[PDB]
Amino acid sequence: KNSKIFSPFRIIGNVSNGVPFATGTLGSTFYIVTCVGKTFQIYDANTLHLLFVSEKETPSSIVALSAHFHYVYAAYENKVGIYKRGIEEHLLELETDANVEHLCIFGDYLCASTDDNSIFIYKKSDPQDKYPSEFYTKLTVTEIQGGEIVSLQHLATYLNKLTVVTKSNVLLFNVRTGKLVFTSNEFPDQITTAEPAPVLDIIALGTVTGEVIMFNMRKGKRIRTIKIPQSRISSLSFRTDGSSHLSVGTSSGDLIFYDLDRRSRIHVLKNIHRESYGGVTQATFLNGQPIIVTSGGDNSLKEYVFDPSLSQGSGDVVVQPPRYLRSRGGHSQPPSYIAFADSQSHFMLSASKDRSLWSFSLRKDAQSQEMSQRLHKKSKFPEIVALAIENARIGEWENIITAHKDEKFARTWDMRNKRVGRWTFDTTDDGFVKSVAMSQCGNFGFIGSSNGSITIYNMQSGILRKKYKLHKRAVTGISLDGMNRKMVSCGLDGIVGFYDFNKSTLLGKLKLDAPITAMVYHRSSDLFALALDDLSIVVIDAVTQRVVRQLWGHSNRITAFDFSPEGRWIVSASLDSTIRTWDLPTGGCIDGIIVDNVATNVKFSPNGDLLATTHVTGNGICIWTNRAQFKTVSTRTIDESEFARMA
C-alpha cells in the first residue's frame, strides 16, 4: 500500500465534513477548528485564513472536536488525541472497545462519553500540568438513570460537576466523587442539543420537535419554552455582546434569532446550509462580538455579523438583520474532473457532480472560488464529462472548453474573468459531445461527437471552420501536436485517426484489437497513450504511426491515466482500486499502490513534483508528492504476485 515514488501530504478543497466545529481564543485571535475526515483544520476568526493542520491523519474518523487555548482534543474510535498546533503530544486510549461519542474538558478534567452510556474521567497528574492525562475513574449511566447520552456539558460555577444531558432527561454527576447528585424531571420530547447559557445555572436544551427548553438546574424547573412547530433543533448559541439574543439551528437549514428580553423573533436566515446535508450542523456566537459562525455538512463554513442599530434611540427595537461577511465552501460532492490551471502550479480547476465549477488555490492561502455561470448576451449546467485548458492566450478570449452530460454542445469558460464565455459549440451531427481538446496556440477548439464527427471551431470568434468525418462510432479522444500540423483522434470503433491539420488529409489509419476509451497526448515527446478496452495501455508515436509500448497488469477498466511532464512515466488508475507507475523506456511497472477508494482521475503537475488524484468518495482532492524529484528511483519491475497478494 506504500508507494516508493509518491506519498500523501494534504487534501485540498474541504473545510468541514459535518462534525460540529469548536471555537477557542488564543490571546486576541479567535480560531475555529473543523473536522475534515481523518484530519482537521484551524482557521483564524479574523480572516478565516488557515493556520495549522494535523501533522498525521488519524487511523479512524474524528467523531468529536473540543478546543481549549493551545490544545484541541480530537476523539476517534476509542482513543482521544491531544493536539497542539497540529502536532501530536500525548494520546489517550480508553480501556473499552466502545467508541467515544462526546467530549467535555473543564478545569483539569477531560470527560469522554462512549456509545455504551459510559463516561470516562481523567485528571491532570499535576495541578500545573498543561493537559489532563491521568485516569481518575469511570462513571456509567444506566438505562434506569436515563437514556442515551446527548452531550457532556459543564456549567459555570460548578465545582467538579458534569452536567450530563441524556435522551430521557438531564443528569448531574460529581466527577470528583463519581456519584449522581441530581436527576432532572423527565421530558416528553426527545432531546437533541444542549448549550450552556452565560447566565448561572441555566442550560438551553433543544428537542426534535422544535422546542427550546431553558432548564434552570439549580431550581430544577423550566424557565422558558420557545416553540418552532415542524422543526428539529440542531445547534444553539447565545450572543455575549451584551444583547440578549438566541440562535436556533434546524435541519431545514434555517437559522432563527430570538430576543429573550422582548420574547420576539428578530430575523430568520433561510437555507444557509443544505437540508439534505444536515442543514446547520453547528452555529456559534463568538465570545463578546456580534459575530456568529455557521457550518454544515455541505462542505461550507459561513459567518454572519450584526451591524449596529440605525436608530439613535430604541436601538434594541431597531435591530439590523444579520449580514453575510465572509466564508468558504467547496464541492458538496466528489469532483468528477481535475486539471492544472497554470504552469506555475498555483491553481487547479475542479468539477463535481454538484454541477459547480471551482478553482482551488494550492498555497497556504487556501483561497477557493466558484466559477460564475452568468451567461453573456449578444439552474446549474449539467455536470462535465471532459475538460481541456490552455494558457497561451489567457486574458484575450476563452481558454477552457467543457462537455456536459447528456448535452449536445460544449461550453466555454474564461479563467481570467472567472466567468462563462460567449461561445457555444455544437456537434452538428445530432450527437452528444464525448471529447474536447484545444490547440497549443489557443486559437482552435476540437469537439468529438458521439456519432463519430470531429468539429473544429475558433476560440475567439466561436465559428465552425473544419469538420472531419472518419469515425462511425463515438470519438473518445482528440489531440493536436505543438506544431499544429498533425492531429490525432481515437474512437470507440477501435481505430486511431491521423490527420494533417494544415492540409486536412489522411496521413494514415491504425486499427487496434480493442476499443479505445481515452487519450493523452505528450507534445514534447510526441507520444500519446491509449486506454484500450482489453485492460491495456497502448503507447503510440505519431511520427512513425506504429504501436510503441503495450502495458499489461490492470485487473479492471482503467479509470484515468496521464503522462509524466518528463514523458518518461505513465501512472494509471483502474477499477481494481490500484495505482500503477509504468516506466516507458523499459515498458514495465515499477511501483504499485492500493487505494481504499477507486481513483477517478489522475493528473501530474506541470513541474512534476506533484500528483493530484480524485476518488469516488470525499469532497476534497488527494494531492501527492513525487519523491523521484528529490532522489533517484529504481526501475526494477514490481512483483505482480506479491502485489496481487497485497490486494
Partner: peptide
C-alpha cells in the same frame, strides 16, 4: 434621499 445603510467595516475585539 433614502436611508444610507453602509456595510461598515467590522473588526473584532
Amino acid at each position: 434621499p433614502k436611508v444610507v445603510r453602509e456595510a461598515k467595516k467590522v473588526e473584532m475585539t
